[PDB]
Design a protein around this ligand. Structure first.
Ligand SMILES: Cc1cc2nc3c(=O)[nH]c(=O)nc-3n(C[C@H](O)[C@H](O)[C@H](O)COP(=O)(O)OP(=O)(O)OC[C@H]3O[C@@H](n4cnc5c(N)ncnc54)[C@H](O)[C@@H]3O)c2cc1C
Ligand SMILES: Cc1cc2nc3c(=O)[nH]c(=O)nc-3n(C[C@H](O)[C@H](O)[C@H](O)COP(=O)(O)OP(=O)(O)OC[C@H]3O[C@@H](n4cnc5c(N)ncnc54)[C@H](O)[C@@H]3O)c2cc1C
Ligand SMILES: [Mg+2]
Ligand SMILES: [Mg+2]
Ligand SMILES: [Mg+2]
Ligand SMILES: [Mg+2]
Lengths: 204, 204
């Protein structure tokens, strides 16, 4: 069971910078084994290179509440009723940083929140046919009564409003499509599948 | 409760295509309302434009099984032990096509699967800080005993292997990180939250 081939079965011949700006787009040139027993020819794929992220689900296990952050995401505009989204605390991981240190820093900058205990949720590839981006989600213990107001770093044009909802309310917003970004959907579905055990662990 | 601002509260000044090849990278230039009042100055964001996708979770409600498709995703290479991933049937939506039309066509091309009934799962933004991509997931009724072999369009260098596993095994592979692409994580978490009702609905 499981996948068929490993890194022994693919060679990346070269990568070519197609675009270099804030982010990059790279042409990967590679060959790989085929399920029928042969080797492919040279394949090329355009890959959006934008680094990787840490994501924090801020969960108050005493109150059974979730902290959401609201901010504009212009890329949502063309397919959404509004480009302002309800999301998880999150940010890019820079060289030498840990997932958990980024999560804590962003929780303070984006929601004014201190974080207590943490546990991993899941680490996922956002859209691996066209981007390398991986996002690593943690759940962090918070006191949701301390989560309120307008945050974000103005010098980076980051304008963020905190919302506090019950867990059940956040999950219903997923089921209704009011929360519809991957990081939040994955985190809140995970929470709906693990909240009993997590609340026990964090309130004993 | 809910979001604060709408499309009336943002002005997209211009979009500039910075790169065009198979996909595009666009620079959005815009200004938007601020939570504390007033308007931002001009902000620019680089946005990866690659269209939008339909995703099909193939679920056999008689057997409580899912059909997975395996193929290489070279963008996974740098952060994964292998770039061959276990994934949902999925494909790009072309002009005029519906999510359902694409899901049914791809199920045949990628897994040799006829699909009976379908239902919506969720529609999500893959990573809206840097890409506009939206993926719309359906669950599709299949006979997993018909699922086997190698598929994909060899003329597009699409080499795909079918795997059939129990729902429980697929979900445990999500928990373990062996399935870690957003579309499959979201779909299989949804299935874990809804399978009892879905099996009752589809075996009446
Ligand atoms: C055709 O069914 C659209 O689906 P897709 O491109 O999402 O699926 P896939 O099978 O991932 O892609 C369909 C075809 O689109 C092209 N394609 C997909 N992703 C890329 C990429 N990153 N760069 C270049 N070409 C790509 C390839 O020709 C691929 O065979
Ligand atoms: O950390 P993050 O940039 O991912 O979080 P975000 O709040 O998405 O971004 C932090 C900062 O990085 C920059 N940034 C994020 N996404 C983009 C983008 N698509 N294009 C240009 N700059 C961006 C912005 O200055 C933003 O203030
Ligand atoms: Mg952020
Ligand atoms: Mg931030
Ligand atoms: Mg596909
Ligand atoms: Mg296909």
């Amino acid at each position: 069971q499981g996948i068929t081939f490993s890194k022994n079965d693919v060679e990346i011949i070269a990568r070519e910078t197609l675009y270099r700006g804030f982010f990059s787009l790279d042409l990967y040139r590679f060959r790989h084994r085929l399920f029928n027993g042969g080797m492919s020819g040279e394949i090329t794929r355009e890959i959006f290179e934008r680094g990787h992220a840490a994501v924090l689900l801020p969960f108050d296990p005493v109150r059974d509440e979730v902290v959401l952050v609201e901010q504009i995401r212009i890329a949502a505009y063309d397919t959404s009723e509004s480009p302002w989204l309800l999301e998880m605390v999150a940010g890019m991981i820079e060289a030498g940083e840990t997932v958990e240190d980024v999560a804590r820093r962003e929780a303070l900058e984006e929601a004014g929140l201190e974080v207590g205990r943490t546990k991993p949720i899941l680490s996922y590839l956002a859209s691996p046919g066209g981007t390398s981006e991986r996002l690593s989600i943690l759940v962090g213990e918070v006191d949701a009564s301390t989560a309120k107001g307008i945050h974000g770093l103005a010098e980076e044009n980051e304008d963020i409003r905190v919302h506090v909802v019950s867990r059940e309310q956040a999950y219903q917003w997923v089921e209704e499509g009011k929360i519809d970004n991957a990081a939040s959907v994955i985190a809140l579905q995970w929470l709906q599948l693990h909240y009993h055990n997590l609340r026990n662990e964090w309130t004993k």
